[PDB]
Write an enzyme that holds these catalytic residues in place. Structure first.
Site, PDB file in Angstrom:
ATOM      1  N   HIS B  41      -5.510  -5.386   7.274  1.00 19.98           N
ATOM      2  CA  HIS B  41      -5.501  -5.831   8.168  1.00 19.98           C
ATOM      3  C   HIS B  41      -4.571  -3.895   8.644  1.00 19.98           C
ATOM      4  O   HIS B  41      -4.171  -3.921  10.119  1.00 19.98           O
ATOM      5  CB  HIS B  41      -3.462  -6.146   8.564  1.00 19.98           C
ATOM      6  CG  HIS B  41      -2.495  -5.551   7.647  1.00 19.98           C
ATOM      7  ND1 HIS B  41      -2.268  -3.628   7.857  1.00 19.98           N
ATOM      8  CD2 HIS B  41      -1.915  -5.669   6.402  1.00 19.98           C
ATOM      9  CE1 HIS B  41      -1.503  -4.224   7.539  1.00 19.98           C
ATOM     10  NE2 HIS B  41      -1.255  -4.545   6.057  1.00 19.98           N
ATOM     11  N   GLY B 143       4.164   2.224   7.804  1.00 19.98           N
ATOM     12  CA  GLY B 143       2.721   2.824   6.737  1.00 19.98           C
ATOM     13  C   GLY B 143       2.706   2.429   5.578  1.00 19.98           C
ATOM     14  O   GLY B 143       1.610   3.163   4.987  1.00 19.98           O
ATOM     15  N   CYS B 145       1.952   0.035   3.276  1.00 16.64           N
ATOM     16  CA  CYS B 145       1.319  -0.586   3.625  1.00 16.64           C
ATOM     17  C   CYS B 145      -0.415  -0.080   2.626  1.00 16.64           C
ATOM     18  O   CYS B 145      -0.633   0.982   3.151  1.00 16.64           O
ATOM     19  CB  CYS B 145       0.372  -1.510   4.534  1.00 16.64           C
ATOM     20  SG  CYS B 145       1.348  -2.442   4.942  1.00 16.64           S
TER      21      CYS B 145
END
Lengths: 305, 305
Positions: B41, B143, B145
């Site tokens: 993503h 942030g 992830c």
């Protein structure tokens, strides 16, 4: 979101952990530049520890009686001195992995990371708080002496703690990196009393802010109080007295959340006097006091190293 | 002695964390050998995330649209592929700091360390448990992830988790390192239901053993029970059913402490049915379920890496 007791990343410290052996006592030491630091009680037998004469015990030791190993590499000792309760062994080799570092003496209620080590090898990392009575509630088995506590500040490691002993009561005591004990303790296997402990009031208030930030608000009540009113409740409940300094350090959190410090004090008062009902704040059924206001802020804004 | 929620030392993982940027989404990736892994993503705008067509979104991306930086050094991308929900970016350079590693898919109730990162930089480390409903209760800001979860086994790092999302409910979901979600989740900003969660019964029993080891014994009662009797109480209280497998994994702890598993079950039953009285076990007013029997044993015997 989410709130967890987070330790600093330990990589920087892992590269400073060495094994120190003297006679047949082995423990952990910290190799920075061309100096290894460890508890002076490395030079004691189990029997010595009952009433050590450290200067006498040290006088019978030469440089070559200190077996300092860094993983598989074995360092060579060219100098030894005692500074308060730590040995400083001077070695031929400067540690290539030496981080930028300070030695810091912390204050009660301040928090730090412990890298719990055995035989110069990392076991684990957890975040601890220096209790008001200068003990810590750690996890420390036999051989863990010399494990250090540290804070990290971008790329600089501030060493604040070296582990030296478990008290007969199951809590933990040690020194700064110059060898001065936190608290009234001495490096002797004798019965030694830690004072009355107390809760770190300013830390608990920080955690209530963390809670509000993460959406736990049920404990916010509609009452207020004064600083003196609060403190006279705090004392009754074995809580540290909240000063203006503490209100001021809570100031940023006050601004984020738009809740006056004294109204959060009123909430906590009603928790203290009334308990929690079997309810939970950030997953805990007790009031947590091991997050400093700075910790809540770093975790909530997510600072990196 | 002492008992704390201990993370693995993170040094080994810290040397694999890189920043990945695509368009103006930046997150964390894991650089092992000549491959960087991250959430697919990374290729999504805030608007894409509402209904992503990942193959379509990926087809508009070449190698040079992926800005992979490892501290100050910037790697060069020579290949990109999507594997389930992770991107694998192939880079010109093998990571010199690549530890020995496996990719592991863990089971619910198993625990691991999270190295929470922002912009390819370590923030902190804490120990988490994969809930029975395949979520985790982490600490994850924007942030974070690409942050990974891992277990360490002497010198081998078993990566089990990559962080992908916060659910509308505030809990966390992600994948193994092959890009398969834990649980029913998908990498889309839609309302997604985590199932009923339950307590990890075998973990709670391990923690009661840890307690006995550390001297908290008040909760030991003088009653016994059967496996089936217990389970029919467990279910009433949203506890996982205890199997023979679980009794068997508790076997060593049973031997250390000389308390039959089924008698510890009888104690826990009387905690479940009766609560704690405002009393505490290992400093907690709740029953803790984030220590596996292996965790209790490593911590109690002090295993190193």
């Amino acid at each position: 979101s989410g709130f967890r007791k987070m330790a600093f990343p330990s990589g920087k410290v892992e590269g400073c952990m060495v094994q120190v052996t003297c006679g047949t006592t082995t423990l952990n030491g910290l190799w920075l530049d061309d100096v290894v630091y460890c508890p002076r009680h490395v030079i004691c037998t189990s029997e010595d520890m009952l009433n050590p004469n450290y200067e006498d015990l040290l006088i019978r030791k030469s440089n070559h009686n200190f077996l300092v190993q860094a993983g598989n590499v074995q360092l060579r000792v060219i100098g030894h001195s005692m500074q308060n309760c730590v040995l400083k062994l001077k070695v031929d080799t400067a540690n290539p992995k030496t981080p930028k570092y300070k030695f810091v003496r912390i204050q009660p209620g301040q928090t730090f990371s412990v890298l719990a080590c055995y035989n110069g090898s990392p076991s684990g990392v957890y975040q601890c708080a220096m209790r008001p009575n200068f003990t810590i509630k750690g996890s420390f088995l036999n051989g863990s002496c010399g494990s250090v506590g540290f804070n990290i500040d971008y790329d600089c490691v501030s060493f604040c703690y070296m582990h030296h002993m478990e008290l007969p009561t199951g809590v933990h005591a040690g020194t700064d990196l110059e060898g001065n004990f936190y608290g009234p303790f001495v490096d002797r296997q004798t019965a030694q009393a830690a004072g009355t402990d107390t809760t770190i009031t300013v830390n608990v208030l920080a955690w209530l802010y963390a809670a509000v930030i993460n959406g736990d608000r049920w404990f916010l009540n509609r009452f207020t109080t004064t600083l003196n009113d609060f403190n006279l409740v705090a004392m009754k409940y074995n809580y540290e007295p909240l000063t203006q300094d503490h209100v001021d350090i809570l100031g940023p959190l006050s601004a984020q959340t738009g809740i006056a410090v004294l109204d959060m004090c009123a909430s906590l008062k009603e928790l203290l006097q009334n308990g929690m009902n079997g309810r939970t704040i950030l997953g805990s059924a007790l009031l947590e006091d091991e997050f400093t206001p700075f910790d809540v802020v770093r975790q909530c804004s997510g600072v990196t190293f």
